[PDB]
């Protein structure tokens, strides 16, 4: 027998966190800081989305002007893409990647905190445009060239948008540098490159894509700021200015969407084998598919520029189909992982299945968008809106929640209540499909995107009502998760074991909950890509060797 | 209090043969692990370059 | 058809018909793939669940290289057939016969349109009109912009109505005075970005419909973010008969506004598929 | 020495990202060169190819001296490293002064950022490269101070190595930009 | 470390092939000749991957196998000292605040605020870089 | 011997796992009751500068000997006050160390026994423990 | 319309939340049912310590209920 306490500590004493928040080089605390701040920014973006949907419920302009609605979708898109998704990627990276490779830290612990604070302050700078009397940016998140000049949209909110994006991009580049260096030269003795999990590979390729993409956006933003302040002629339509901005921006922006897609593919590829009681299927195949996606996400940038009539349609359309193939391979590998196993739908596995369904439908919609003749009708319409919301809830919402539910015990030492988790998942699923299934139809029969107001004779009222109802279901779905996290942090069920999910595979389940400072008091003999499984179940090693090949 | 009770964190990490990542602490007093000193209202060093 | 096209309006040009058929086929393929993969997901979730009897971990298999390559190559075939049909259709929708029958100088300015009737040349040889106005074009050298004698300026109170014949080849030359706009007529199943200087930016601002099949009234919208009133920039295309079209052109020749000529040609004077927007910034005004 | 140095690899990957930033600037320059119509550079621009060659040669010489200072710092000689890096700092300062002088002479001759598209792209690209050069000079000063304030450990040698890496990236980018602007035209 | 290098020149090979294909397919069969923005970006993406891969290959040509690059490795092989990791610092937040001051001064075009932000950046970067190298006070 | 999913590690630590959806701690009491007991123990032992401990389980026969045995495996047995409760044998015991002498526990250990009994009559184990620990803590002053 | 659709947006989320909470909250959790003094103490021996202040026995007391 041994002594304990009846319950663990609810909260630390006074002055236990604030100086850590200011001065920590700990990657786990910094990952938690990303998680919390990214979720707050997600709430702000969703509030903007609810305002837009409430306005779009009825054909009249009830409470929003056109200026305000343009501000709202510009800032909603900007916040959701750049202040929630891109930084939550590095939040998850900081949370688990040093644990996954058996490292005591990231390569540059101070550069990590610098990246986080650059995130926070750039996001704040870009959002502070509402404080201006002219309002925040009201030209969309894509910032197309002539509309963004000193003449058209001349306010200060757009300039704050540009510079906040510059600061956040610098932070993202620094974080990517840190992740690449940490992966390259900080692994444990046994951990070979082909023994890191899928998540580590995905963060590595994501960091490569970040290094490729974000400097382009920074240079484009600096040219735009030159044209706005110094009256430069970089993007002037007399030159090839408008197409110059389109090319530069999309060379950034499609790598951006794959940057926010790949790490969550890694998250689900981590979660699936645990709750499947099986190994991840096609480990090497998944590594190569991830590499193929990373390589191909750089030459397809002009499938967003079909309607301009100034690009090579066959080249980009073919490259888009070619990049569509590997994601199909990835779904096949995930299905093979779930196939013929023992599935228990604790909340992360349920969220991963939701990811599968939602992102599959989004990918089908994207393939439809890939054909230039079909994009000639459905571009700039709510069909694009529905497609990219489907892929974005696939990656950065269902898989974000799956990862949060999965790695909450590892980071806090407490469980999240599974009943509130199931309620939250079903609310999210129903609300999301309610609010985004009908927009395919709404865009097919022409309702363009970014319209603040339409006509009663347009014939769009019923589907917009359904969309607004679903949007408010999505709004009320955040209460179960917020309440669950808030109560479970302090009064959550204690975890006194390693791997409270039973069949964890990677090294983060070989240490305690939470891991101590430097993450490891001992390291196991690493011999495959699931070291914790072999450690915790040593009778299964010969099984796994003998039965690894299906044929 | 943390500095007084564990000693200054030197920023140096060692991997022990069994896999333990430990940080090298420099005690400000004698060791038995250091004997925890008593706070005396004075500033404490927290970087090793400041101790020479 | 009606439900399987997921809402695309029935085409009114041969290019629109072909595009709609390609969309129907592509939606069939996409929904078939989705049905297959979702059936796999539901078969795995419903069955293959950890039972009360299940005592030992399952077969720890993770590599099935043959099936991996089979399902690697199947999507390549699907995207190959899609690419072939795509290139065929997108080349058909950009044919550009060197002799148009009606030419329109579409000009988009800050939240309205302006049509030109640059050069009408009927194929039967019954009507030839040369509306190009080069003195106005040279008066401001925006050389890229095009002017014409007969115009239809959209206003805050009047929706600009384009009048065209049926069965006659129509060419649109797109120009924008200020910023990028969008020329979309949801019935053509086709839209194009209206750029400031389409030539200096290497863009093809010209596109043709071989023939508008049936006459009527059709709404058009701006489909490119352009600023405050982006949602309040609609226009209308009123396809009429060739003889009615010639009569309308002749009335417009003798100093007649659009509404007056439309009334003269036994048609509604104003837009009927869209209405002008209330200038009031909201209902709380 | 049986492991790689991570400060070096981090510097290398970040330098590659900075190369991508200058890729964006190069894409800005190449466009509007094809829109001018062959009159490139247009009047009243007349590139002073008599001061641009000397500053290019001084930058190459500074790269050579910086590598020599790396050689000095690899054997633990802090004083030789200090000497070579002070020489490199002075010659990079001379390069910046020459760039500013050419800027002044060009602006005096009706070539400005708002004046023309060629001016816009030329001053944008060259000024951003000059900002990177000034950042390198600040890095040199900070490194020399740090070598002054502690015993010359291998960590100091690593810092000097990565500062030289940045300097080499800078002057290679300048070689490319000079070849693109004053030769291809 | 052969794997990391090899991944980087695989990316380099694909990027070079794509860049050359784009340049050729835009020189002929495009509206206005070579596109000059996708081509430039693709060529310099090739350059980015080339630099990283070349440096890693020069490192792998000059390295005996590490524990982590060696299969059948035992934890005891990796035993010893790793290096210096900063235990704590409040300089990153100051650097970020300085860069944010500069960014606000250049968003709202205020040259004085730009200069103040730049000076603050130099000061906070000096503080970060000098943090573990300042000696004991002389007195 | 190690449970299923448990393994010995190179540093002596026992790395164990729990079933998905299963709990590592499964005390047969409400969570908030455990929180209240933790607060009672920690704040009472903070005020009295003596470690209060609660033991629940079998005492067999000769309960005094069993409780005095259990006391010695508290982290600081000398400054420790352990209250043992055996519901199968319905026995309440208080045992305290040598350094807890003449501080105030002499008259307060029977007080804690009486409080725990007057709460156990109704049939509340945790609540009786709370009352006993509160009373015993309030009955002891620091060294 | 304004009477109705506002009611839809206000109330459909609320009724969906209500029904899903009835389904998913009132369910049995994994926390074990609280012990009853009537039943035998089958749980393993429990030793809790306050662990706030960071062998020989010199006192004691006894009693019963
Ligand atoms: C706005 C602020 C409002 C909240 C603060 C008010 C509550 C409070 O008590 O404040 C004290 C609290 C800590 O005070 P303390 O005295 O140092 O510690 C005593 C506590 O008991 C702390 O004791 P502890 O150490 O045991 O606490 C443990 C745990 C305690 O945490 C909890 O108990 C629950 C936390 C979650 C609540 C619900 C979150 C909902 C989001 C869901 C998403 C979660 C995903 C999960 C992911 C993880 C698993 C993968 O905290 C953690 O370990 C993780 C930290 C959580 C995030 C920390 C803050 C992130 C952002 C950092 C600052 C960015 C803004 C700076 C503004 C500009 C700067 C100039 O915070 C502060 O002192 C900051 C002052 C707040 C004023 C506003 C900021 C000034 C400008
Ligand atoms: C664009 C923004 C440029 C930011 C450049 C930062 C990228 C560098 C990332 C890879 C470096 C790896 C590293 O560990 O950095 C050390 C350190 C990270 O600290 P840690 O986590 O403890 O890493 C542990 C290392 O083992 C500890 O390594 P260590 O102590 O041996 O550090 C060696 C070396 C490491 O530093 C380098 O890698 C050399 C790279 C020089 C970059 C020059 C910037 C050019 C400005 C472009 C703007 C146009 O640092 C030095 O000894 C001297 C160089 C530091 C001066 C930085 C230049 C001042 C910036 C002011 C620019 C204003 C001029 C425009 C007006 O990061 C820095 O010192 C630079 C931070 C710059 C803040 C961004 C401000 C915006
Ligand atoms: C929206 C607003 C955002 C809200 C959040 C923003 C707050 C930012 C937090 C600043 C972090 C500074 C800090 O925590 O110092 C802790 C500092 C160190 O305590 P310790 O390390 O535990 O004990 C020392 C050891 O015993 C003895 O060992 P030791 O050697 O480590 O101690 C000496 C060590 C540290 O000893 C110190 O106490 C240094 C205190 C530095 C003051 C920094 C304030 C500026 O070295 C020094 O003395 C450094 C002297 C150099 C100072 C001059 C350099 C100027 C700063 C860089 C210029 C860039 C400014 C950014 C521009 C922003 C424009 C908006 O103690 C303090 O708490 C001092 C008060 C903290 C400053 C509060 C200022 C409030 C500002 C309101 C919001 C803005
Ligand atoms: C536009 C408006 C904004 C612009 C700024 C406004 C004007 C700025 C006023 C600056 C005046 C400061 C004092 C001038 C007198 C010079 C003092 C001196 O020579 O002794 C060296 C002095 C150390 O003397 P110490 O008494 O032996 O230090 C005792 C501990 O060992 C020290 O150990 P510790 O760890 O506690 O010290 C921490 C701290 C060391 O600094 C301090 O502790 C004193 C606080 C001054 C920090 C700089 C704040 C200025 C901006 C805010 O480390 C830093 O923060 C590095 C900051 C260096 C920035 C220099 C670049 C600025 C150029 C801008 C272009 O070094 C410095 O504090 C900074 C030197 C920078 C002054 C430039 C001219 C002197 C160059 C020295 C060459 C040898
Ligand atoms: C999560 C981020 C993310 C991801 C991963 C994707 C992935 C894809 N996207 Fe897109 N996309 C966006 C985010 C993303 N996208 C955003 C934000 C916009 C709008 C930006 C704006 O304008 O504001 C956009 C817009 C956009 C456009 C431009 C439309 C326009 O601007 O008007 C196109 C064109 O091709 C496109 C297509 C695709 C395709 C083919 C994929 C492929 O990667 C999908 C791959 C998936 C599958 C292919 C399904 C799974 C495969 C199988 C089951 C095998 C069998 C399947 C077949 C044989 C088809 N999406
Ligand atoms: C990460 C990707 C992402 C996410 C998560 C979202 C989130 C949502 N989005 Fe959005 N969206 C985009 C990507 C995304 N979006 C992009 C790229 C654009 C383009 C913008 C542009 O063109 O510039 C866009 C814009 C956009 C449009 C196009 C509008 C138009 O063009 O006319 C629509 C259409 O319905 C929409 C709807 C929604 C809804 C209902 C949610 C819901 O998921 C939101 C759910 C969250 C909530 C509802 C929060 C609930 C609020 C509270 C609980 C109150 C508490 C808040 C505080 C205390 C501050 N958003
Ligand atoms: C930003 C991009 C920066 C590029 C640097 C190039 C600087 C090179 C200088 C170019 C010289 C020139 O072109 O001067 C002629 C014109 C005058 O026009 P004028 O009236 O006709 O002539 C005069 C007749 N009296 O300068 C101008 O417009 C003013 C140009 C001033 C440049 C200011 C530099 C900005 C610094 C950016 C810092 C970024 C910080 C942000 C952090 C995220
Ligand atoms: C142009 C930028 C200027 C940056 C200023 C950096 C040098 C100032 C502080 C360095 C102090 C060096 C001496 C340390 C003490 C010993 O000697
Ligand atoms: Ca409305
Ligand atoms: Cu895309
Ligand atoms: Cu578009
Ligand atoms: Cu418009």
Residue numbers in the entry:
A (entry chain F): 11 to 561
B (entry chain B): 438 to 469, 473 to 492
C (entry chain E): 28 to 168, 193 to 336
D (entry chain G): 19 to 203
E (entry chain H): 1 to 139
F (entry chain J): 15 to 157
G (entry chain I): 2 to 55, 69 to 79
How do the authors describe this structure?
It forms a ‘dimer of dimers’, containing two copies of subcomplex III (bc1) and two copies of subcomplex IV (aa3). Subcomplex III consists of the three subunits: QcrA, QcrB, and QcrC, while subcomplex IV consists of six subunits: CtaC, CtaD, CtaE, CtaF, CtaI, and CtaF, complemented by PRSAF1. The QcrA and QcrB subunits of cytochrome bc make up the Qp menaquinone active site and share high sequence homology between M. smegmatis and M. tuberculosis (QcrA: 78% identity, QcrB: 82% identity).
Therefore, we engineered a version of M. smegmatis cytochrome bc in which all five residues were mutated to the residues found in M. tuberculosis, which we termed cytochrome bcMtb-like. To establish how JNJ-2901 interacts with cytochrome bc, we determined the cryo-EM structure of M. smegmatis cytochrome bcMtb-like bound to JNJ-2901 to a resolution of 3.1 Å. This is the same binding site as for the other cytochrome bc inhibitors Q203 and TB4724,25. The density for JNJ-2901 is well defined allowing for an accurate positioning of the inhibitor. Only the end of the tail of the inhibitor shows weaker density as it is located out of the ligand binding pocket and has no interaction with the protein. The interactions with the inhibitor are mainly hydrophobic in nature with only two hydrogen bonds between the protein and inhibitor.
